[PDB]
Design a binder for this molecule. Structure first.
Ligand SMILES: CC(=O)N[C@H]1[C@H](O[C@H]2[C@H](O)[C@@H](NC(C)=O)[C@@H](OP(=O)(O)OP(=O)(O)OCC[C@H](C)CC/C=C(/C)CC/C=C(/C)CCC=C(C)C)O[C@@H]2CO)O[C@H](CO)[C@@H](O[C@@H]2O[C@H](CO[C@H]3O[C@H](CO)[C@@H](O)[C@H](O[C@H]4O[C@H](CO)[C@@H](O)[C@H](O)[C@@H]4O)[C@@H]3O)[C@@H](O)[C@H](O[C@H]3O[C@H](CO)[C@@H](O)[C@H](O)[C@@H]3O[C@H]3O[C@H](CO)[C@@H](O)[C@H](O)[C@@H]3O[C@H]3O[C@H](CO)[C@@H](O)[C@H](O[C@H]4O[C@H](CO)[C@@H](O)[C@H](O[C@H]5O[C@H](CO)[C@@H](O)[C@H](O)[C@H]5O[C@H]5O[C@H](CO)[C@@H](O)[C@H](O)[C@H]5O)[C@H]4O)[C@@H]3O)[C@@H]2O)[C@@H]1O
Ligand SMILES: *[C@@H]1O[C@H](CO)[C@@H](O[C@@H]2O[C@H](CO)[C@@H](O[C@@H]3O[C@H](CO[C@H]4O[C@H](CO)[C@@H](O)[C@H](O)[C@@H]4O)[C@@H](O)[C@H](O[C@H]4O[C@H](CO)[C@@H](O)[C@H](O)[C@@H]4O[C@H]4O[C@H](CO)[C@@H](O)[C@H](O)[C@@H]4O[C@H]4O[C@H](CO)[C@@H](O)[C@H](O)[C@@H]4O)[C@@H]3O)[C@H](O)[C@H]2NC(C)=O)[C@H](O)[C@H]1NC(C)=O
Ligand SMILES: CCCCC/C=C\C/C=C\CCCCCCCC(=O)O[C@H](COC(=O)CCCCCCCCCCCCCCC)COP(=O)([O-])OCC[N+](C)(C)C
Ligand SMILES: CCCCC/C=C\C/C=C\CCCCCCCC(=O)O[C@H](COC(=O)CCCCCCCCCCCCCCC)COP(=O)([O-])OCC[N+](C)(C)C
Ligand SMILES: [Mn+2]
Lengths: 110, 163, 41, 112, 34
């Protein structure tokens, strides 16, 4: 059950890391709830068997996935900074990208 | 600007001088030729310069500029299908050569997330990115970069032979 | 039909879900930025 | 009969796509509302995002400006979603980003 | 206005000046920088 060994070691390292810093906790919970929101919308579509406004469903799902990827990028840059980018720059760039994605998804839903 | 990132400024000056008067471009950029290509072929280079700055710096802002100019191009020329199939390939290649790095993840996922949702707003190109064969390459590279990030945290955690 | 003349998002009972989700994500991002700056590591 | 009364003709329109019953779509809005509330409670009560290290010196008048920029952009987008033109949105973004950029780069420079 | 043989001479002169400035810049940069 080498799978179990790797699983337990990963859980150990991850929970230790997220207790050592709170900001990583913020990012991880935000990502988890974004995944929950995506599951909820997929479940709506499946349950009703129709997706009449495809531009609205696409807007919701895409805002969720884009926020997830942006949060993961910020987390990467935070845990181990890049060569020429400080963490204030990695935060301002994230803010700008998030605002642009918000505007695009708001225009997509009509 | 694109050639100053590959080698040096002198090479960029040489390339600008070459492309200023090369006939292969003049054929379609002559005064009076008011077609999509005139603008497009400029936006192509303006987009590849930002994709190379983002891919070799990891910046999210440069990836966002690349996505914005990519959107500017899907809305000007029907040959935008070049970029959407040449930027994934690059990333894809860098994965086979064993050169994956967090900068790659950041750059590509930002570019895709922004540009794909902004390219569906053009009435002409609408819903094609999700249902056409021209853009399935970018989607597959999107998925592959997430399985590779996961495996670059997990395999990096455990020892080599344990893989 | 012009791009303007189409039943808006709030008029379709099928799209209340997606707009609610967009609003929820934008308000969670707005609270996340504030709580990321305010609190220290 | 080539010249004479002729039978009528009426166009046949298609049935517009159906929209899910309302009581089935309000439950999902309630689910999403509860989910967002639970997210905010998870942050507020898991020892994370605790509201400490709040600036209170001169940099506080900059922190509020930073908040003002962020929330103000989300207000502009809201207005736009509600019907405001695109040119008015661009001009509002310009007017609100000219000083907001400065106030929010100064906040980041002062907050180490 | 300007004729055609004049615009040809002007185009050629612009090109020659550009390629000579580029060569001078490259020589200067390659000789005075490791
Ligand atoms: C030869 C040829 O081909 N040609 C072509 C052409 O071309 C040309 C051009 O044009 C010109 N130009 C000029 C300017 O002039 C020239 O050129 P050039 O120069 O060349 O140009 P360029 O650009 O430059 O080019 C060049 C470039 C190149 C490209 C180069 C390249 C480069 C490169 C580099 C490449 C590379 C690549 C690669 C890949 C690489 C690789 C790499 C790697 C791999 C690595 O010249 C030329 C030539 O000479 O063009 C044209 C056009 O333009 C064309 O045409 C076309 O075609 C097509 C095809 O066809 C085919 O197919 C078909 C199928 O489709 C078939 O059928 C056919 O067959 C047959 O058919 C017919 C029948 O009848 C017959 O008759 C015939 O005969 C035939 O045979 C064929 O086969 C087609 O398709 C088209 O069509 C179209 O169009 C038309 C016009 O109009 C129409 O009519 C139609 O119908 C169509 O349309 C459509 O679509 C559109 C868009 O697109 C629209 O607009 C319309 O309306 C329609 O739509 C409809 O349908 C659709 C489909 O079904 C749908 O989808 C829609 O819907 C949508 O949308 C709407 C509106 O917007 C909306 O509404 C909706 O949405 C709604 O609903 C939904 C559902 O339920 C939902 O979901 C949602 O929700 C909603 O939404 C709504 O509501 C809401 C609330 O409630 C709100 O919110 C919102 O807002 C709203 O929206 C959606 O869905 C509709 O239904 C055409 O025809 C030719 O061809
Ligand atoms: C690209 O360009 C080309 C060329 O310009 C375009 O091609 C033209 O397209 C036209 C429509 O798209 C088409 O017109 C139709 O042709 C049908 C084929 O008929 C042929 O066979 C019959 C024998 O069955 C011949 O008599 C006839 O001459 C043809 O050879 C016709 O069947 C269509 O007639 C119906 O529409 C016209 C006008 O709308 C009515 O006057 C006619 O009475 C028919 O109307 C019935 O259907 C409509 C709805 O479609 C109802 O509103 C109406 O009340 C009638 O309803 C009865 O019938 C339906 C079943 O049909 C039934 O359910 C109902 O209860 C009633 O009993 C029409 O004439 C051209 O022929 C075609 N030309 C060529 C050269 O191809 C092409 O569209 C363009 N593409 C684009 C724009 O995208
Ligand atoms: C830091 C903060 C950053 C903020 C974000 C900044 C930029 C975002 C980046 C990309 C946005 C992508 C989405 C595009 C939406 C366009 C809005 C619009 O095209 O108008 C749309 C028109 O619909 C359309 O047909 C869209 C079709 C797209 C065609 C655009 C032409 C291409 C132009 C390319 C660039 C040209 C530059 C010229 C000079 C260089 C609405 O207009 P409306 O007046 O009807 O209002 C309506 C208000 N409803 C929506 C609530 C009802
Ligand atoms: C980013 C920078 C880019 C720089 C390069 C860009 C563009 C240049 C490339 C190609 C130019 C194509 C030449 C087309 C000429 C056709 C018209 C023609 O043929 O004029 C010629 C005349 O010319 C000249 O003597 C003009 C000599 C003046 C020298 C230029 C002054 C400097 C201007 C540039 C700076 C301006 C602002 C400075 C401060 C901000 C024929 O005049 P005419 O008989 O038709 O009418 C006139 C009728 N009278 C004769 C009665 C008057
Ligand atoms: Mn053309």
């Amino acid at each position: 059950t080498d799978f179990q060994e790797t699983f337990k070691t990963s859980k150990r390292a991850y929970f230790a890391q997220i207790e050592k810093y709170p900001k990583l906790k913020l990012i991880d919970t935000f990502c988890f709830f974004l995944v929950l929101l995506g599951v909820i919308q997929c479940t709506f579509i499946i349950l009703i068997r129709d997706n009449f406004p495809f531009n609205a469903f696409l807007a919701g799902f895409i805002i969720c996935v884009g926020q997830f990827v942006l949060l993961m990028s910020l987390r990467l840059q935070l845990c181990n900074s890049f060569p020429g980018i400080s963490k204030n720059r990695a935060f301002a760039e994230f803010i700008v990208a998030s605002l642009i994605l918000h505007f695009v998804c708001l225009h997509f839903i009509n | 600007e694109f050639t100053k990132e590959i080698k040096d400024a002198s090479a960029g000056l040489l390339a600008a001088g070459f492309i200023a008067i090369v006939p292969g471009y003049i054929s379609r950029s002559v005064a009076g030729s008011y077609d999509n290509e005139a603008i497009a072929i400029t936006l192509l280079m303006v987009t590849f310069m930002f994709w190379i700055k983002a891919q070799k710096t990891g910046s999210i802002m440069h990836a966002t500029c690349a996505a914005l100019f990519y959107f500017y191009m899907v809305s000007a020329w029907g040959g935008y299908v070049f970029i959407t199939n040449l930027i994934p390939l690059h990333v894809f290649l860098l994965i086979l050569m064993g050169r994956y790095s967090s900068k790659l993840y950041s750059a590509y996922t930002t570019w895709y997330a922004i540009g794909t949702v902004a390219s569906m707003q053009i009435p002409f190109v609408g819903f094609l990115p999700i249902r056409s064969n021209d853009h399935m390459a970018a989607l597959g590279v999107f998925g592959l970069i997430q399985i590779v990030a996961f495996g670059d945290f997990v395999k990096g955690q455990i020892s080599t032979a344990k893989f | 039909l012009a791009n303007d003349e189409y039943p808006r998002s709030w008029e379709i009972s099928n799209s209340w879900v997606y707009i609610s989700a967009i609003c929820g994500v934008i308000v969670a991002w707005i609270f996340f930025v504030v709580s990321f700056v305010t609190t220290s590591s | 009969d080539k010249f004479g009364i002729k039978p009528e003709i009426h166009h046949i329109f298609h049935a517009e796509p159906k929209r899910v019953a309302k009581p089935i779509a309000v439950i999902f809005v309630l689910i999403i509302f509860i989910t967002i509330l639970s997210l905010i409670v998870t942050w507020l009560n898991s020892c994370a995002a605790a509201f400490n290290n709040i600036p209170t010196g001169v940099t506080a008048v900059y922190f509020l400006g930073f908040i003002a920029t962020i929330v103000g952009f989300e207000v502009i987008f809201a207005r736009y979603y509600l019907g405001t033109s695109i040119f008015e949105t661009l001009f509002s973004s310009l007017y609100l980003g000219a000083p907001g950029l400065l106030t929010s780069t100064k906040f980041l420079r002062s907050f180490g | 206005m300007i004729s055609d043989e004049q615009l040809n001479s002007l185009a050629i002169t612009f090109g020659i000046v550009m390629m000579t400035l580029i060569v001078i810049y490259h020589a200067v940069d390659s000789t005075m920088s490791p």
